[PDB]
C-alpha cells in the first residue's frame, strides 16, 4: 500500500485527496493491528494534517499525551518521554523563546494537546505566558473560543477533525498570523479500600472523599452511591483538591483524598503549606504505589513534618490501619497500596511496640538479622528468611505497620540484631531504610543498616528476588561474624 | 481614639460614614506608627457587611490581614472552596465564606483549578479579587460585580450587599558584600562571556538580584509571575533549545515546581540551573533535590566558592544544577588547606590529636565547624572540617575521609529528614563504610543547639560512648 511508500513526512506532499483517504484507513488498520485507538483513529487524520503543513522536525511538533504522537510516529519515526500532564505547552512556549534569542523564529513551534490537558492550572498558567507575547506558537487541541477568544488568543475552529482539508486550511492559515493562536479540532486491594471506606462512614458521618477526576480508578465510585453528597470530584485539579480538603478539615470533617502515588508530587507544596503546616486531620489514600510510577512517595512523605504514613501488606492491614488513620485527628496521615490484586492473608506472631513480628530465627539460631519488609514485600521477606534458615541465620521479619515516623518497636527490636535490612517497595533515596536508619542514629544506635529498594534513577533486572536479596544479606552477615 | 473604642465588628455598623472616614484616617496613621493602605475601606466594608465569627473572611496574604486583625499563595480560594462544602455538610450554610485575593493570583494555576470548581456549584463563595492598580469571570460562570473604586467604603459595601444577595458565587473586583549581590556580580559576569545564558523568575526578580541582570540584558530576564509550574518546564524548553537557564527559586516555593524538576528537567537531563536564594523557610531543600535523580547542588561556604560553583554549574550541560545559599552579608572568605576528591579541606587534626571526629559544613556552618574543631581541640579530640562544595551526589572525597576517622558529624543548614547527613550515612553504608554518624541540624518541624558549644558538648558525647550496637 501507500504506507509501505512513506518514507517520511515529504512523500505525503503530493497525494491525492482520494490518497490521502485510503492512508487515512491503511493506518487505522496498522493501529488496530499493532494494539487507546480513539486518540489514535482522531490524531490518524488531524497528523496527516500537519505534515502537509509543517517541516517537521524544523518546525518542532509538540505532543502532549505522547500516545497522539504515534500516528506522528509512524510518519517520522520518532516522538520528539513523559512529563507531568499539560506541560507540552510550557515546553513550546520556552522552545519559541529560546529561538528568538539564537535567531531561529523562522522555526514554528507547534503544540498538539488534548481536551484533557486544557486543565489545570500549569495550562492555564503557560496559556498566560504565551498570550502575554506576540511569540508564534500554534496550539492544536483535539476535542472528542469564548474562553481562548477572552484569553488573548486567536481562534480557529471549530474544525471537522475528520476533514483532512479543513484541518490544512485551518493550520495554514495559524501558521500566517504569526503570533499565538489556537486550532480548534473536533473528533482486590482497591476494592478492600472502598468496602472498608464504606463502613468506617457508615459508622461516622465526619468522613468524606475527594478525588482527581479518577474515583472509578481509585475505588471510591461506590462511596459516592452510598453517600452521595460525600464525594467530591474535582476533576483533574490535585492542586486544589488537597487544599479543599483543608479547608474541608478546617470545617470539623475528616477528609480522604485518594491521588495515585505517581500523581502526588504535584500537591507537595500544598501537603507542607495547607495540611501539615496547620495539623489538619488528612488522610491521604496512595494506589500505584510500587512497581508491584511512584517509588517516591516515602521520601516525600517522610519531608512532611508530623506524618503519619503506613503501608499495608495485606487485605487485612489495609481495614485495620484505614481505621487508624481515620482516628488521627491532630496530623495528616498516608496509605499505600499497590496495584496488583490482594494476596492472602500473613499472619504475625506477636505484636511489639506497634511492630508486626512476622517470623522469628528458629531454635538453634541467632538473632543475627532483623529483616524490615515495607508496603507488600513482606511475602518476599518470608522467602529470604526462608532461604537463610536453611544457611543458618537466624532471621526477624518484621511489619512496622505504621513507616512513618519510625516506631519505638523497630528500635526496640534493631539493638537486639547485628544487621538490619531493610526491604521497600520504594527509591533507596530518602526512602524507608534511608528514615529507619536515621531515626536509630538519633538513638545512639550504631547497628549496621542496609536499604535494599528501587533504585534512585529513571525485577530479576533489579536484584528484587529473594534469591539475590539472600546472597547479598548473606555477603553481609559474613562480614560481621559470630556471636550473639 | 476611635480604633480604641471598637470592641466587636458590631460596633462598626452603627458608626456614620464621616465616623467611619475618622476610624480609617486613625487606622492609617496606626499603620504609619507600626511602620495594606488601599485594602482599608475594602476591610472596613467586609466588617459592616459580614460578621467575622459567623462569615469567615480568608485573606491569602498576611499583609491585608493586618487591618483585619486590628479590628501558600492564591490558596485562599481552595480553602473558601472546602470551607463552603463542609458549612453545606454540617447543617450551618448560612455562614458566607468570603475569600479576599490580591491580583496576580490570579495567574497562579492553582486559583484556576479552585475558580473552575467554585463555578461548578452553587454554593455561595463571594471572591473578592483586590486589584492594586472582567470577561473571563462572566464566561467563568461567575457574576462579577464590577470595577468598585477601593477608596470609596461606600461603594464597596454596596457592592459586597450586593454579592451576599446573589445566592451563587461572585466575584467582586476592587481597584485600589552580600549574598545575592555576590551572586548577580557572578551570574552577569558569567553571561557576558555566554550567549546561551538566560534567567526566568516568578515574580521575584529584585529580592533574586535578576533584576540587574535584566537591565544589562533586558532580552534574557523572563518574569512568568505566579507560575513557577511553568516557570520550571519553560526552563526546560529553552534548555532544549541549546539555551542555560538560570532559574532563581525561594526555597519555601520549590515544592509546587517539583514535579516539573522531576520529570520536565531530571528525566530529560536538560541543563537547568536552579539557583536557591533565602535557602536555609529554606529547610527541606537538600532533602527534596536529593530525591531528584542526577541532580547536583552545590552549598557555597562564602563569596569566592559562590563565584566557583555558580560557574562549575554553568559547565554541567548533560543534567539540573542547584546552587543553595542563604540570604544576608556572606562572611569572610575561608581558603582550605588542601582540596582532596573535590572536597576543600578546612582543618586537619594539630599535631598529638588524631583523626578522630570528621565535620562535614554543609551551606554556611563552615564558620561554626571551625569553632568547634577549636573547642575540641581544647579537650584532646582532633577534628578535620571539610566543606564538600558539591553536596548532593556525595563525592568520592568524603568517603576517602570518612574512613581515617572514627565520627562522623554533617553540621548542615537544613531538616534533619532526607538532608545532607542522611545522603552522606546512605553513601558510605552502600559503599559498605559502617563508621557512625550525627546529623546535627534542623528538627524536621515547621519550627535551636547550634551553637558552637551545644555542637561541642554532643560531639564529645558521642566520642566517648562510640560504637553500639547487640
Known amino acids: 500500500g501507500m504506507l509501505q511508500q512513506i518514507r517520511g513526512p515529504a512523500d505525503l506532499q503530493h497525494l491525492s485527496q482520494a490518497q490521502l483517504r485510503e ?5 487505522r488498520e496498522f493501529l488496530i493491528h499493532k494494539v487507546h485507538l480513539g486518540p489514535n483513529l482522531g490524531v490518524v487524520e488531524l497528523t496527516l494534517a500537519l505534515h502537509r503543513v509543517f517541516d517537521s522536525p524544523h518546525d518542532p511538533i509538540i505532543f502532549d499525551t505522547g500516545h497522539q504522537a504515534y500516528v ?9 518521554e ?18 528568538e534569542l539564537t535567531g531561529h523564529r523562522n522555526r514554528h513551534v507547534v503544540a498538539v494537546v488534548g481536551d484533557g490537558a486544557l486543565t489545570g492550572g500549569m495550562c492555564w498558567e503557560a496559556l498566560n505566558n504565551i498570550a502575554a507575547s506576540r511569540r508564534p506558537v500554534i496550539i492544536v487541541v483535539n476535542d472528542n473560543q469564548l474562553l481562548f477568544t477572552d484569553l488573548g488568543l486567536k481562534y480557529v475552529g471549530p474544525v471537522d477533525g475528520h476533514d483532512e482539508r479543513a484541518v490544512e486550511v485551518a493550520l495554514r492559515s495559524a501558521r500566517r498570523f504569526g503570533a499565538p493562536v489556537i486550532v480548534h ?13 464504606i463502613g468506617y462512614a457508615q459508622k461516622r458521618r465526619d468522613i468524606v472523599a475527594i478525588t482527581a477526576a479518577m474515583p472509578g480508578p481509585t475505588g471510591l465510585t461506590a462511596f459516592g452511591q452510598r453517600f452521595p453528597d460525600r464525594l467530591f470530584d474535582v476533576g483533574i485539579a490535585e492542586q486544589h483538591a488537597m487544599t479543599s480538603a483543608a479547608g474541608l478539615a478546617m470545617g470539623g470533617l475528616h477528609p480522604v483524598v485518594a491521588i495515585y502515588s505517581t500523581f502526588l508530587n504535584r500537591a507537595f507544596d500544598q501537603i507542607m503549606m495547607d495540611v501539615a503546616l496547620h495539623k489538619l486531620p488528612v488522610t491521604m489514600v496512595l494506589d500505584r504505589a510500587g512497581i508491584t510510577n511512584g517509588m517516591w512517595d516515602l521520601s516525600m512523605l517522610g519531608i512532611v513534618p508530623g506524618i503519619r504514613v503506613a503501608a499495608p501488606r495485606d487485605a487485612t492491614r489495609l481495614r485495620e490501619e484505614l481505621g ?9 496521615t498516608a496509605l499505600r497500596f499497590p496495584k496488583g490484586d490482594v494476596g492472602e492473608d500473613i499472619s504475625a506472631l506477636e505484636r511489639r511496640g506497634g511492630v508486626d513480628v512476622l517470623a522469628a530465627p528458629a531454635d538453634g539460631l541467632n538473632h543475627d538479622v532483623l529483616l524490615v519488609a515495607i508496603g507488600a514485600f513482606a511475602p518476599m521477606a518470608l522467602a529470604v528468611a526462608k532461604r537463610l534458615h ?19 518497636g523497630v ?11 531493610t526491604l521497600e517497595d520504594n527509591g533507596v533515596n530518602g526512602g524507608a531504610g534511608s528514615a529507619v536508619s536515621a531515626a536509630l542514629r538519633r538513638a545512639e544506635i550504631d547497628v549496621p543498616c542496609r536499604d535494599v529498594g528501587l533504585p534512585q534513577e529513571f525485577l530479576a533486572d533489579l536484584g528484587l528476588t529473594d534469591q539475590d536479596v539472600a546472597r547479598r544479606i548473606t555477603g553481609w552477615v559474613a562480614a560481621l561474624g559470630t556471636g550473639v
Open 23 to 27: 492512508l487515512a484507513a491503511e493506518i
Open 72 to 80: 506522528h510516529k509512524m510518519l517520522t519515526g520518532r516522538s520528539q
Open 82 to 99: 513523559s512529563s507531568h500532564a499539560s506541560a507540552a505547552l510550557s515546553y513550546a512556549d520556552g522552545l519559541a523563546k529560546a529561538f
Open 185 to 197: 479540532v473536533v473528533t482486590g486491594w482497591t476494592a478492600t479500600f472502598s468496602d472498608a471506606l
Open 324 to 332: 487508624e488513620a481515620l482516628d488521627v485527628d491532630d496530623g495528616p
Open 390 to 408: 536453611n544457611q543458618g541465620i537466624g532471621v526477624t521479619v518484621i511489619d512496622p505497620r505504621w513507616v512513618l515516623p519510625v516506631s519505638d
Open 411 to 421: 528500635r526496640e527490636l534493631a539493638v537486639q540484631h547485628k544487621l538490619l535490612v
